[PDB]
Paper text:
Product complexes were generated by incubating [name] with the corresponding DNA substrates, allowing for enzymatic hydrolysis of the N-glycosidic bond and formation of an AP site and a free nucleobase adduct. The conformations of [name] and the abasic DNA are effectively identical in the three structures. Within the SCPCHD binding cleft, 14 protein residues contact one or more of the adducts. Only three—Gln38, Lys156, and Lys194—form adduct-specific hydrogen-bonding interactions. Gln38 interacts with the hydroxyl and methoxy substituents of the S−1 subunit unique to YTM, while Lys194 interacts with the methoxy substituent of the S+2 subunit unique to CC-1065. Lys156 contacts all three adducts but only forms a hydrogen-bonding interaction with the hydroxyl substituent specific to the S+1 subunit of CC-1065. YtkR2 also provided significant resistance against CC-1065, which was somewhat unexpected because of the presence of the unique S+2 subunit, and suggests that interactions with this subunit do not play an important role in determining substrate specificity. Indeed, the outward face of the S+2 subunit is largely solvent exposed and has the fewest protein contacts of any subunit. Thus, [name]’s substrate-binding cleft can accommodate each SCPCHD compound with strikingly few adduct-specific interactions.
The [name]/YtkR2/C10R5 enzymes belong to one of two known bacterial DNA glycosylase superfamilies that have evolved a non-base-flipping mechanism as a means to remove structurally diverse duplex-stabilizing adducts. By contrast, the BER pathway removes small nucleobase adducts, and is initiated by lesion-specific DNA glycosylases that hydrolyze the N-glycosidic bond to liberate the aberrant nucleobase from the DNA backbone. To understand [name]’s lack of specificity for the three SCPCHD sub-types and comparatively high product affinity, we determined crystal structures of [name] bound to DNA containing each of the three adducts. We previously showed that [name]’s low level of protection against YTM results from product inhibition in which the enzyme remains bound to the newly formed abasic site in the DNA, slowing multiple-turnover excision, as well as impeding subsequent repair steps in the BER pathway.
Author numbering: -1 to 225
Write the structure that this text describes.
Amino acid sequence: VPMHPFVKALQEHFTAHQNPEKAEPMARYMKNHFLFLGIQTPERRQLLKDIIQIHTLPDQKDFQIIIRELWDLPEREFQAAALDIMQKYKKHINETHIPFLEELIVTKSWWDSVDSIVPTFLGDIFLKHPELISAYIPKWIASDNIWLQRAAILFQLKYKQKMDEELLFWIIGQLHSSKEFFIQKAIGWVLREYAKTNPDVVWEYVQNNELAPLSKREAIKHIKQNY
DNA sequence: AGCAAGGC
DNA sequence: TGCCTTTGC
Ligand SMILES: COc1c(O)c2c(c3cc(C(=O)N4CCc5c4c(O)c(OC)c4[nH]c(C(=O)N6C[C@@H](Cn7cnc(N)c8ncnc7-8)c7c6cc(O)c6[nH]cc(C)c76)cc54)[nH]c13)CCN2C(N)=O
Ligand SMILES: [Ca+2]
Ligand SMILES: [Ca+2]
């Protein structure tokens, strides 16, 4: 049972606004891994602010506590709300939080949570602390947890000109032989995105290094006309 | 705004 | 394969 007053309040307010007809297609979209209340993102964020303005954003001492309690509730809107709350504490998230973010990645895992945790929060941490990459990324690749492997691929997604090209291509080479849908997809995604910045090096990489066909097609889909 | 980014 | 729905840029 949740015991933090903010979480109890958010649970009551969200639950009061559930829509079972809406919850069904929302849950099916996430392959029925999760129950849903049936609250889509615009309403969900207004209902969150309803609770924040009563209680005030909780002291930062509680932020992990609050996110963990929301992560433990069954309906997916509580994890989506938890991510919205993390965005409000961005300032206080730093390298000491990497293990916490790891736990979130591997608990109630799916693309909707992992893709929100990794490029923003881990991306920012490793930009400030790039000497720490080697303590996490190799371990994530070797874990055969597909969401930590996707995290290794995607933490640089939004780096643009900050991209560590040699590291990106090494990570991709370690994972190119994965059968996994979400790994083949992530490789295609990061290569297509980085090609917006550095197309020539993505072209050369894809022409000289093995990739699954889905990944290769995605990587080059907006630059192949130039070569 | 109106363009862009899983599901099937 | 490429269009759909919802969410993000
Ligand atoms: C080529 O360059 C670009 C441009 O060039 C250019 C623009 C852009 C903008 C981008 C660009 O990139 N954006 C934009 C859109 C987006 C990015 C992005 O980064 C992301 O990652 C950080 C994005 N993450 C998501 C995402 O989380 N989604 C989305 C949704 C799931 N969904 C639905 N329908 C689809 N078709 C999907 N496809 C993949 N997911 C899909 C969904 C979630 C999350 C959830 O919890 C969901 N719960 C239920 C649903 C349905 C659901 C969206 C997203 N790039 C651009 C704007 C103008 N412009 C111009 N003028 O030129
Ligand atoms: Ca392996
Ligand atoms: Ca797609």
